Design a protein around this nucleic acid. Structure first.
Ligand SMILES: [Mg+2]
Ligand SMILES: [Zn+2]
Length: 462
RNA sequence: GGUCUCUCUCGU
RNA sequence: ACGAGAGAGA
């Protein structure tokens, strides 16, 4: 992706969008109990911790565009993927506004605890002023779909969250593009059923992990991904995508039966406008972070990308022997013969993608189940039942979370959640965690899950 | 102060 | 089941 122009809001007539500049994060009662080196992300240009210009840092992610149209490797990649999806028989028909707005069995309702985006957010209009759980009223929606129409600009906010110290120094906070509720509704109406299908079928047919539950999914992945594992990280995946990958997406949609009216919406997320503070700017390429379908479209593109890269980098690739699961930019994949990602990465650079060794390795090494990660979790076979696989969230990470809170009122829930993640690392690590938590007065006041009970409940899931 | 998923807690 | 809240992941 790449910024095409920047204009002041006076010149575009777009309402200023301002977001909070102070973090909700505060050190917790456990801050000094556990070691960690993340802090709240820079939210403001005059952050003492800065070492670079904030705004230049923020937008440096739009590295530019290389390809704009599909070459023949990408076309072939598209069609191989699209043919694979066909067996799922996605209903290409349009979802009703009621279901799009209020949800189904395989699609959660539009989040009403969350901004309504442009222009409501600057008009003081929240989602709850237009939508109602109990009424399932769509009447007000319709009136506004007409009043403000579609393709409204995304509202740019900085993400309040913990970042590594190096990232706080270098101003590399992350950005979210709040979608207008109008575009969310319409995108959900156009692709709601695809959403449903993908949520219901995490695995190697969708080539997507959206909808998975790591507690149980982790045991299938070595059966779903037979043979030689490969994986790698992307730097700035979303923003790095060139318009060709959106053309590529269009070809997949067409091939599985979407109308041209439907397919035409892809260009409306390849080419987007955004309001950050007092300015309007244009982005060509780049997945808009907070559009409806972000995770699914990113996963789908990632499936195209991996196929294209394989058949361009190597001779004799049989795409049918590829297995992969993506979650956005995150990937785990397998092939009957080991795939050298150094080479894939070289090819990826010609496509505008920056690919790095899995897990901040210094160089491209072998990926095996013993060191693979996915959704930040490792893979650790249970000692008693080796076919049952623990997702292992590293205690290091968990230590980062517990050292802060956005509201110490919810400490109990927060700690319990961490424990639910922690225990997979085993008894000795888990009790080490627990007794460190007990080492502090609030800690002794918390209900902490018993290990054996966690384990026993885990086994019973199978 | 986005899009989503998963899980937990608390209600009725 | 419906509501509310949280945590984590992408
Ligand atoms: Mg990964
Ligand atoms: Zn534009």
């Amino acid at each position: 992706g790449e910024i095409q122009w920047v204009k002041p809001n006076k010149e575009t007539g777009r309402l200023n969008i301002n977001g909070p500049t102070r973090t909700k994060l505060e050190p917790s009662v456990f801050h000094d109990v556990f070691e960690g080196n993340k802090e709240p992300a820079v939210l403001h240009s005059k952050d003492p911790r800065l070492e670079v210009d904030f705004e230049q840092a923020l937008f440096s992610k739009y590295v530019g565009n290389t390809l704009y149209e599909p070459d023949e490797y990408i076309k072939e990649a598209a069609l191989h993927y699209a043919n694979q999806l066909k067996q799922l028989d996605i209903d290409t028909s349009q979802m009703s506004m009621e279901e799009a707005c209020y949800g189904t069995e395989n699609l959660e309702a539009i989040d009403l605890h969350t901004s309504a985006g442009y222009p409501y957010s600057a008009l003081g209009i929240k989602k709850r002023d237009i939508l109602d759980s109990t009424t399932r009223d769509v009447s007000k929606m319709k009136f506004y779909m007409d009043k403000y129409g579609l393709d409204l600009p995304y509202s740019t906010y900085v993400k309040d969250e913990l970042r590594s110290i190096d990232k706080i120094k270098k101003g590399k906070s992350r950005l979210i593009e709040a979608s207008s509720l109008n575009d969310s509704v319409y995108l959900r109406m156009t692709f709601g059923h695809l959403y449903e299908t993908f949520h219901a079928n995490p695995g190697t047919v969708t080539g997507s992990a959206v909808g998975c539950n790591p507690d149980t999914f982790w045991s299938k992945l070595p059966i779903l991904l037979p043979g030689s594992l490969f994986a790698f990280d992307y730097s700035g995946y979303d923003a790095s995508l060139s318009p060709v990958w959106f053309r590529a997406l269009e070809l997949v949609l067409r091939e599985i039966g979407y109308s041209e009216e439907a397919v035409s919406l892809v260009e409306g997320i390849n080419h987007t406008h955004h309001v950050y503070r007092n300015k309007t700017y244009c982005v060509l390429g780049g997945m808009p972070s907070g559009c409806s379908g972000t995770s699914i479209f990113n996963s789908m593109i990632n499936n195209i990308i991996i196929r294209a890269l394989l058949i361009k980098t190597f001779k004799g690739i049989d795409l049918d022997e590829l297995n992969m699961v993506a979650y956005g930019d995150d990937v785990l994949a397998s092939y009957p013969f080991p795939i050298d990602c150094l080479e894939l990465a070289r090819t990826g650079k010609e496509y505008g993608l920056t690919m790095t060794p899995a897990d901040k390795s210094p160089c491209f090494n072998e990926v095996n189940w013993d060191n693979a990660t996915f959704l930040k979790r490792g893979f650790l076979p249970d000692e008693q039942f080796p076919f049952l696989i623990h997702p292992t969230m590293p205690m290091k990470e968990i230590h980062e979370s517990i050292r802060w809170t956005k509201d110490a009122r919810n400490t109990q829930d927060h700690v319990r959640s961490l424990c639910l993640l922690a225990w997979h690392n085993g008894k000795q690590e888990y009790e080490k965690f627990v007794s460190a938590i007990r080492s502090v007065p609030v800690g002794k006041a918390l209900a902490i899950p018993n290990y054996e009970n966690l384990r026993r409940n885990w086994l019973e899931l199978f």
